[PDB]
């Protein structure tokens, strides 16, 4: 029913109303940690071990990514490997070619006659396939595709996080609640990531992508397919914008006008757009406003434009073509608005 607000959940209402400090005590030193353990050069050496055999005269080279190597991760948190056969790393596929997902099911035999690994789901149909498998020497459970895109927008992420922390606390602080008010079915840990940092780009904390992008004399793309996945590695000094020490009082300042931004943005004309990095980006007008590259991928193949005719739109802003929120309905939207609200007015001061 749309004339009433969706309670939010007791067991997010428990976190927010309690102590900020509780919700980072452990989890940020936890996450920092994670970043670089020995297990994970274990996983890469027997990840290489057990699959160069079966692409014998083929270069192999396997790529983290995700959560726990941006900083935002727990021990419970999958590892996100991407295994590069042949180089395949510049080479886009929106959906995946016969060839990847053949590599793909080849793959999965290894892991199962192997003693090292129990294979858990083979998912095929997805976007991005995945292998997901457990290491067993570790007990890390690993998310293995051949699809360069989030290890790239990984980068983007831990340069952020590096440079301005205060990023990286919010997203670990949203991600947990993202999980306590069940609304990970329809908005991913990276959309919530993205939405912080389009956030706080309008903070002037954070640089537009597109900035970091300029192509001139002395800085080229790195491209894969249309997309540019590099970036200037810019000091926050080079670029002018302040760094701050993330605080108790300084996140929590910040987390609820996160909420009250999002609870009072207009889904139906304006999109979540860490690319363009400004304020109020129409739905309208994005798709005119991208680089030459996109324009002509989209006119070379009309199918694979970004999904605009949907409730919420957040723009990776790399690969420009995906709405990454485009499996949100409308009711998920009036939820996640809904808790946005209510979470912002119990972080307020008296
Ligand atoms: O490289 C990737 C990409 C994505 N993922 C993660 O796989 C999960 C499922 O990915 P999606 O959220 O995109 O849903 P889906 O499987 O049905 O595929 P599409 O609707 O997009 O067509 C998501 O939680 C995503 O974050 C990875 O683990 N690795
Ligand atoms: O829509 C998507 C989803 C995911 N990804 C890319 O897949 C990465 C892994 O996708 P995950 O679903 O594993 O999320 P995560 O690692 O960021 O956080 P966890 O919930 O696992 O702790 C993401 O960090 C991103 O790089 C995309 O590029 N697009
Ligand atoms: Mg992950």
Redesign the pocket.
């Known amino acids: 029913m749309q004339h009433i607000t969706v309670r939010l959940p007791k067991k997010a209402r428990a976190m927010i109303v309690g102590e900020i400090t509780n919700v980072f005590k452990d989890k940020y030193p936890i996450a920092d940690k994670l970043k670089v353990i020995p297990e994970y050069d274990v996983i890469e050496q027997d990840l290489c071990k057990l699959l160069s055999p079966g692409f014998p005269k083929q270069p192999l080279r396997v790529y983290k990514?995700?959560?726990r190597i941006?900083g935002?991760?727990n021990r419970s948190?999958?590892l996100?490997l991407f295994v590069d056969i042949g180089n395949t790393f510049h080479t886009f596929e929106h959906r995946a070619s016969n060839a990847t997902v053949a590599k793909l099911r080849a793959m999965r035999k290894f892991f199962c006659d192997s003693e090292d690994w129990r294979l858990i789901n083979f998912i095929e149909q997805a976007r991005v396939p995945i292998i997901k498998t457990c290491h067993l020497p570790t007990g890390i459970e690993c998310?293995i595709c051949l699809n360069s895109?989030?290890f790239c927008?990984?980068n983007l992420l831990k340069y952020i996080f590096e440079s301005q922390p205060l990023t990286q606390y919010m997203c670990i602080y949203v991600?947990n609640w993202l999980e306590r008010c069940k609304l990970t079915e329809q908005i991913?840990?990276?959309?919530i990531?993205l939405m912080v940092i389009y956030f706080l780009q309008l903070q002037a904390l954070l640089p537009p992508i597109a900035m970091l992008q300029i192509e001139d004399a002395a800085n080229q793309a790195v491209l894969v397919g249309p997309w540019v996945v590099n970036f200037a590695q810019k000091s926050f000094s080079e670029l002018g914008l302040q760094q701050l020490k993330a605080t108790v009082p300084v996140i929590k300042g910040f987390l609820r006008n996160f909420f009250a931004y999002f609870a009072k943005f207009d889904y139906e004309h304006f999109l979540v757009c860490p690319y363009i990095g400004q304020a109020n980006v129409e739905i309208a007008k994005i798709e005119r406003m991208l680089h030459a590259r996109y324009s002509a991928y989209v006119s070379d193949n009309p199918e694979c434009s970004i999904q605009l005719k949907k409730p919420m739109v957040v723009q990776?802003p790399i690969q420009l073509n995906?709405n990454?929120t485009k499996a949100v309905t409308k009711y998920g939207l009036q939820t996640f608005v809904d808790y946005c609200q209510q979470t912002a007015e119990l972080l307020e001061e008296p």
């Open positions: 990514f995700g959560s941006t935002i991760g948190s999958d996100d998310a895109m989030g927008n990984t991600k991913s840990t990276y959309s990531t990776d995906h990454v």
